[PDB]
RNA sequence: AACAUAAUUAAUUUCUAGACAUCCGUUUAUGAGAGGAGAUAAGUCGUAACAAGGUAAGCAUACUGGAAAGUGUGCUUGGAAUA
RNA sequence: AAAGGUUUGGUCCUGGCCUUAUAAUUAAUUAGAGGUAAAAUUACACAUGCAAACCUCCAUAGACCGGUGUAAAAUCCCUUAAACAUUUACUUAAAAUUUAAGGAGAGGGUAUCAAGCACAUUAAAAUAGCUUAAGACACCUUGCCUAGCCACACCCCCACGGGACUCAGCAGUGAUAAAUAUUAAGCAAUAAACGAAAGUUUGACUAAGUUAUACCUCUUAGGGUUGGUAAAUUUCGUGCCAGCCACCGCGGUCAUACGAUUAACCCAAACUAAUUAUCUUCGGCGUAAAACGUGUCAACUAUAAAUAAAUAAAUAGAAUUAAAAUCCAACUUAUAUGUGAAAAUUCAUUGUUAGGACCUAAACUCAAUAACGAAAGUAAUUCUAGUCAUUUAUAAUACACGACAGCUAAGACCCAAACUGGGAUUAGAUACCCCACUAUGCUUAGCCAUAAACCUAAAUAAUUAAUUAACAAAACUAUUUGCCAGAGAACUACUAGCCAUAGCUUAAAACUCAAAGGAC
């Protein structure tokens, strides 16, 4: 049995379900939440379930969490321009908190798709090379082309050993 | 252990694989120094043929000679291999029959 | 890290080596000396190419001509036998400055500056002359300067535009139709912007390398 | 130690010279001689433990003894407990 | 891992070892031919030949290619700036390739390497800081990041200098090693260098030679095995011998286990042996390895409540005393004492005292009680001081404690008692039993820091059903820390700290074994 409570949180599939990919402006997200209370239940669930997913998709964003420092829970984002975006998450479900931050400071689906395509621009199917980078190592693999001499011996007249003998014979 | 304790320690530390009589090498070449008999620890009863050899590394070891009858003498050259002789305690080397001075067992 | 220790000897060697080079720089009289019997340079023991043997015995170096002239021939015109044979149009340098090698016992090695007129076309500024140590130079006489320097330019006949390569022309015309541009104009390359100098055109002596001072 | 010549094309020269030698230490090998552990394995002297093992056993500690061990003090049951 | 063999008289649990799969190197035995890939003991010393030129002189190139794995925890990934020993463009910009200063994160081993010792900041020049159990520092080992990268180039990290003065370029040799390719051909292709160019050059490379190391196509057949795990034995010989096994094991006269035969089995141009590598923590801690002798304070990780205490033996101090001893005195038996029975011891004894002294030592009944305290520990009586609120769990390298025994100095001393002496017993009796008497148990100061310090149960908050390995003490979830990783060697060696000096805490390896261990 996987240790801890809700061990599904420690699976790559769960971490990849996060949908909040912050814009490049976002640099820090401080989380102020209270461990005891009734109006902070969604905030506690947000730290338990959602903070891992956010960090997984935003590795370069500093997430620092402070406990029981204020009467109410809130989220404050620090942007590269110097702006500070304060969010109040009291009486809000953990799902509601995720949706709010996605709207205000989350990249749109269109932007993310464009970045994905740009990443793969330099992979070409026609390119030949090692398996790590290319589909086929050699043109011998292609159908109709002359096969590899190791797998299929070449005709004698196509061999340097034979041609050299003729040149000596001439 | 807790997940915090597994994190602070990481994977189990692995003791290093200490080498044996051949020092992690398939074979060694040695010069015979003495030929003697060793008695197998009970419950077995025999006069097992062994020899002391000076290995190429420079150390000296005791090597069991397998087969029925050997012509080995002092100053001969032999190729030793690994493998302990189960009844003979401390004998962790064996001589290879058919290499250098040691020869194949004479078939009867 | 912090175990990458300093290397005092390496730094000392670099500086010391560089200093010795400046102190013991060779001179033109030594680097470009020649043994005419073997046509081999004593400094490095480099034998000149075979195609240069005839001229090394039959032609003069630039400062051999200039050492015999007042003011080292400032203002005089000098041409090269290679140019005289290759180009019908006048090719010459108009000498402006000349720094002889005082060390030479005949003042036959040095540097020069002047204004180039190649194939009848004259440059606008003076620059250092290359290949001054070559056995190829011919001083122009003062009385023959007017006839030598007389040149009338012919109208340029080298094509200014050419067709595009067969495939590259089809790719251009195909793009026109795709973009809606309808025309039967033939794509044409413009060669005026990228016209090549002759292969023997004088090069920039200022940016050229000099041989080292270690004898072979 | 870093200036001085030169200057009616302009350049020359300086742009240095000692001392970077020992180290204080730090590891490893050698081992006079003195010990330990284990195995070889027919023995010797006792019978300490396992039965209430014939004085229940053991722990810490002290002293004592051919040898296991003995005795004291507190503690444990991984002993017993009706006459 | 779809697992298997092996602890026992037997079963169950726990747990190590080994087997079955895969690949490389070497060795034994054995092999035809062809195609392909790869070639590898050694940063050891190198005989000879070659590996860099080109070209109208100047220049450019010889900084590459090729080689090795030297050094170094060395790096990976990323940011910034700047040039470039360049290219191609412009009189001003696109690249390729580098260099310098850095840092989100990641990055080998040993903590018996626990402290490093200037490792910081400010900018009147003062302040006293910086790194480190979230692993500094020290030491050891290693090429990694793999379309490739990094370091090295005879040695002295460097290379002015000095020295033991160059193949870690191709082929080749010496020595060494278990480890064994041609002192070969050509610049025709591609790549590089040079030239404006026709072209020239190249041990890069191309095409060959060599080699069962691998793959592929064919042809021949050899190699090992045959007790179990694990596919497969006939007969004889041997007789605990000769030999055999990876593990368990086999051989003392009917050996399916050895040797030779016979027949079968497996793989097959190979086959078997040795060596090496490939598999790697969500499991446990009453009885099997494992909860620390005890408590308190930090930083994290978790948790969420707002109290506690409220005269039964905590602790410390002072005072106090009932019973039984001891001493002294009076009287007094002739013996007293002691054992299963004796002996020695003793008559300086013995018994009585409603006689005196003593205040040493220890606290019956209550106690069939289950309180107090962190634990250790604490119960004769009285008085004084005194336990109490941090939400909760979680601490060492700090602090304060810690039975008994023991050490140090000065006292106490009723009784008990190691040692010692005397007496018995016994084959002996350095013991058990008897008698005597010390250290010691007591007080006051200090040390020592160990217990089967064991409820053999870490603490805390839940649950009692959607739950029998065995036994013990019903099962089980969550949180945090500690601890464990076969047995012995080993409460050991070395290291460091300590009032400890025949000490305590900390705590390995070689080597040996195939088990050890728990419950029934
Ligand atoms: S791998 Fe393509 S010819 Fe061999
Ligand atoms: K046997
Ligand atoms: K006993
Ligand atoms: K006994
Ligand atoms: K007993
Ligand atoms: K097993
Ligand atoms: K070096
Ligand atoms: K070529
Ligand atoms: K028989
Ligand atoms: K057999
Ligand atoms: K057989
Ligand atoms: K107990
Ligand atoms: Mg030229
Ligand atoms: Mg007994
Ligand atoms: Mg007895
Ligand atoms: Mg004891
Ligand atoms: Mg005694
Ligand atoms: Mg006694
Ligand atoms: Mg071989
Ligand atoms: Mg290379
Ligand atoms: Mg190395
Ligand atoms: Mg040590
Ligand atoms: Mg060097
Ligand atoms: Mg060498
Ligand atoms: Mg060399
Ligand atoms: Mg070589
Ligand atoms: Mg080989
Ligand atoms: Mg070119
Ligand atoms: Mg056999
Ligand atoms: Mg067998
Ligand atoms: Mg235990
Ligand atoms: Mg006695
Ligand atoms: Mg006394
Ligand atoms: Mg202890
Ligand atoms: Mg106790
Ligand atoms: Mg102890
Ligand atoms: Mg000790
Ligand atoms: Mg010690």
Swiss-Prot record, chain A:
Gene3D superfamilies: Glutaredoxin (3.40.30.10). It is found in: Mitochondrion. One of its GO terms (cellular component) is mitochondrion. The keyword Mitochondrion applies. It holds the Pfam family L51_S25_CI-B8. GO terms for biological process: mitochondrial translation. Keywords: Mitochondrion, Ribonucleoprotein, Ribosomal protein. Component of the mitochondrial ribosome small subunit (28S) which comprises a 12S rRNA and about 30 distinct proteins. Belongs to the mitochondrion-specific ribosomal protein mS25 family. This is Small ribosomal subunit protein mS25. The lineage of its organism: Eukaryota, Metazoa, Chordata, Craniata, Vertebrata.
Curated annotation (Swiss-Prot), chain B:
GO terms for molecular function: structural constituent of ribosome. It is found in: Mitochondrion. It comes from the Eukaryota. GO terms for biological process: mitochondrial translation. The chain holds residues 31 to 138 of 139 of the full protein. The keyword Mitochondrion applies. Its main location: mitochondrion. One of its GO terms (cellular component) is mitochondrion. Keywords: Mitochondrion, Ribonucleoprotein, Ribosomal protein, Transit peptide. This is Small ribosomal subunit protein uS12m. Component of the mitochondrial ribosome small subunit (28S) which comprises a 12S rRNA and about 30 distinct proteins. Belongs to the universal ribosomal protein uS12 family.
Swiss-Prot record, chain C:
InterPro entries: Ribosomal_mS34. Changing residue 66 to P: Decreases protein expression. Decreases mitochondrial ribosomal subunits and translationally competent mitoribosomes. Mutant mice show heart hypertrophy and liver steatosis. Its main location: mitochondrion. One of its GO terms (cellular component) is mitochondrial inner membrane. Transmembrane segments: none annotated. One of its GO terms (molecular function) is structural constituent of ribosome. Pfam families: MRP-S34. Widely expressed (at protein liver). It is found in: Mitochondrion. GO terms for biological process: mitochondrial translation. It comes from the Eukaryota. Keywords: Mitochondrion, Ribonucleoprotein, Ribosomal protein. PANTHER family: 28S RIBOSOMAL PROTEIN S34, MITOCHONDRIAL, SMALL RIBOSOMAL SUBUNIT PROTEIN MS34. Required for mitochondrial translation, plays a role in maintaining the stability of the small ribosomal subunit and the 12S rRNA that are required for mitoribosome formation. Belongs to the mitochondrion-specific ribosomal protein mS34 family. Component of the mitochondrial ribosome small subunit (28S) which comprises a 12S rRNA and about 30 distinct proteins. This is Small ribosomal subunit protein mS34.
